[PDB]
């Protein structure tokens, strides 16, 4: 494949590995989730633009809208977690 | 008359887990109403 797909795919894997390998802050994991969306956006846009598939030009915008909305929900859970414990540390989320 | 479970028999199923181990020795049954104290 073209050069770019290597690095974009590598970027997605890096953020996925970052997502699966938590540290302490829940916000850091949420950043890795949005990093994955970004690389999906770029890889989608490049594929759609290069093939000149015109109607799919909207697809990456739809992806950005829904992922941002998902990110807003994730942020809401983060603040509700932080209100309970005073931090967003994931090791506080072990009652279950 | 026919035997029925007593308190000692019933208390087997009241713990956090069915089979206690050293790993889960600190586990406690969750709150009755699901609400942990603030």
């Amino acid at each position: 494949m073209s050069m770019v797909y290597m690095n974009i795919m590598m970027a997605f894997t890096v953020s996925l590995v970052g997502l699966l390998m938590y540290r302490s802050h829940l916000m850091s994991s949420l950043l890795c989730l949005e990093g994955m969306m970004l690389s999906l956006f770029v890889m989608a846009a490049l594929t759609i633009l290069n093939s000149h598939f015109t109607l799919a030009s909207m697809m990456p915008i739809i992806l950005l809208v829904f992922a941002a909305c998902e990110a807003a929900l994730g942020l809401s859970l983060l603040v509700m977690v932080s209100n309970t414990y005073g931090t967003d540390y994931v090791q506080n989320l072990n009652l279950l | 008359r026919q035997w029925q479970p007593d308190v000692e028999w019933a208390e087997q199923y009241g713990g956090a887990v069915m089979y206690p181990t050293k790993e889960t020795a600190h586990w406690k049954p969750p709150p009755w109403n699901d609400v942990d104290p603030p």
Binding site: - | R1, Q2, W3, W9
Partner: protein, 459 residues
């Protein structure tokens, strides 16, 4: 078979819609009428089986087992109603419903043409039987008895299901009439060795085969009287009936595959007979006695001779009445002294003279006195296994001696000697109890006059 299925189902509304104080009268009376009509199944032909429909048939193997099943329901009702007298009315009706639902599954099990239908019904009998033991047993370890009984069965029955479905795919059918004509020989291969074991192990557990038998004494010690009666008389014979049918499609592999089970049976019958000499629980002694008798049935089925199959059929019927009668006799003592310990209440012939006679007759049939059908069945098996190998007569003969020893030991220990001084509540035998004992032994002894109706298809 609808003339038996439907009236059996109607026993349920009969029981639930009866007046509170008529539940035992009505269920007993009408179950006896169903038992009477069951004798219409004796229309057997020399060549063809009695094939009612696409679902059910009755040959000379299933007919005697059907009659025994429907005879046993009123006897279980009579035997149960005393220790359930304090139960509330709804729970009494639920108990009777389990017994009726057990009859329904059993008569369908014995008459199904297709083997998957037999499997489902064969499995369905587990539910009411398990519920009868765990809900209406007296002691704490009835819960464990249920799990042992449940999981011994399913450990063998699930491989049977896989084999049955595999056989239908290969052959195209599991209708037993079709299998008789489309059966093909089983060649040697590891695949066929496991097909053989999957086709047989479920029935071995039910019998039970020696070495897979420890669930049985556990179950009997915990079951209420009706549970023991149906378990000893009918539920064990489901495995015997299953083996007699499925061996059709296992030749010639049964030739060498039977050996380890024959060895277990031949030696197991001596071991379990000896164990009876040292049992201290009367119910556990009768349970071990069943294991020893059913070991003969397993040998008969595995060696596959016309004489052995006839003996197996007679032994299965004869044992069912005899063992059920012994549990009823043991239970009559228990309802007075509230213990199963055999040595607790001695010298009971002095106190209960007529019940001593029933004990005597039950013991005489248990040790197979000629010409009881107990001996007829045992003798036919002994005849046939001698041809299989002459040395078997040594183990057969030794087992006869030990069986006489423990059968009469039971009789001498409980009925003879001196009575226990402090046991002062041995009230006279009730009419219900005397009728119950006589309703076992009289038909058993009347079968001596016409044994042919219990000798099965090979007759």
């Amino acid at each position: 078979m609808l003339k038996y299925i439907i009236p059996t189902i109607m026993l349920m509304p009969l029981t639930w819609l009866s007046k509170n104080n008529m539940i035992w009268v009505n269920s007993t009376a009408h179950s006896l009428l169903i038992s009477f009509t069951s004798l219409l199944l004796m229309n057997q032909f020399g060549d063809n089986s009695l094939n009612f429909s696409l679902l059910f048939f009755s040959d000379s193997l299933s007919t005697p087992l059907l009659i025994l099943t429907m005879w046993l329901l009123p006897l279980m009702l009579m035997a149960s109603q005393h220790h359930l007298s304090k139960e509330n009315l709804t729970r009494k009706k639920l108990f009777i419903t389990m017994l009726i639902s057990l009859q329904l599954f059993l008569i369908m099990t014995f008459t199904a043409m297709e083997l998957i239908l037999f499997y489902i019904l064969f499995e369905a009998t587990l539910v009411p039987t398990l519920i009868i033991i765990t809900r209406w047993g007296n002691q704490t370890e009835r819960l464990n008895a249920g799990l042992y009984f449940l999981f011994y069965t399913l450990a063998g029955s699930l491989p049977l299901l896989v084999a049955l479905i595999y056989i239908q795919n290969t052959v195209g059918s599991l209708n037993f009439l079709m299998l008789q004509y489309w059966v093909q020989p089983v060649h040697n291969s590891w695949s066929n060795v496991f097909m053989w074991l999957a086709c047989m192990m479920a029935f071995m557990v039910k019998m039970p085969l020696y070495g897979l038998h420890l669930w049985l004494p556990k179950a009997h010690v915990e079951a209420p009287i009706a549970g023991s009666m149906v378990l000893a008389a009918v539920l064990l014979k489901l495995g015997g009936y299953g083996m007699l049918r499925i061996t059709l499609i296992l030749n010639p592999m049964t030739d060498f595959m039977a050996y380890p089970f024959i060895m277990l049976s031949l030696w197991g019958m001596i071991m379990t007979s000896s164990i009876c000499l040292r049992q201290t629980d009367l119910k556990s002694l009768i349970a071990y006695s069943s294991v020893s008798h059913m070991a003969l049935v397993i040998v008969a089925i595995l060696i596959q001779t016309p004489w052995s199959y006839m003996g197996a059929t007679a032994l299965m019927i004869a044992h069912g009445l005899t063992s059920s009668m012994l549990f009823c006799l043991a239970n009559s003592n228990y309802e007075r002294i509230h213990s199963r310990t055999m040595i607790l209440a001695r010298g009971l012939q002095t106190l209960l003279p007529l019940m001593a006679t029933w004990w005597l007759l039950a013991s005489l049939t248990n040790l197979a006195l000629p010409p009881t059908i107990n001996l007829i069945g045992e003798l036919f098996v002994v005849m046939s296994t001698f041809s299989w190998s002459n040395i078997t007569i040594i183990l057969m003969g030794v087992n006869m001696v030990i069986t006489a020893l423990y059968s009469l030991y039971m009789l001498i220990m409980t009925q003879r000697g001196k009575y226990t001084y402090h046991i002062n509540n041995i009230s006279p035998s009730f009419t219900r109890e005397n009728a119950l004992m006589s309703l076992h032994i009289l038909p058993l002894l009347l079968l001596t006059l016409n044994p042919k109706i219990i000798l099965g298809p090979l007759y």
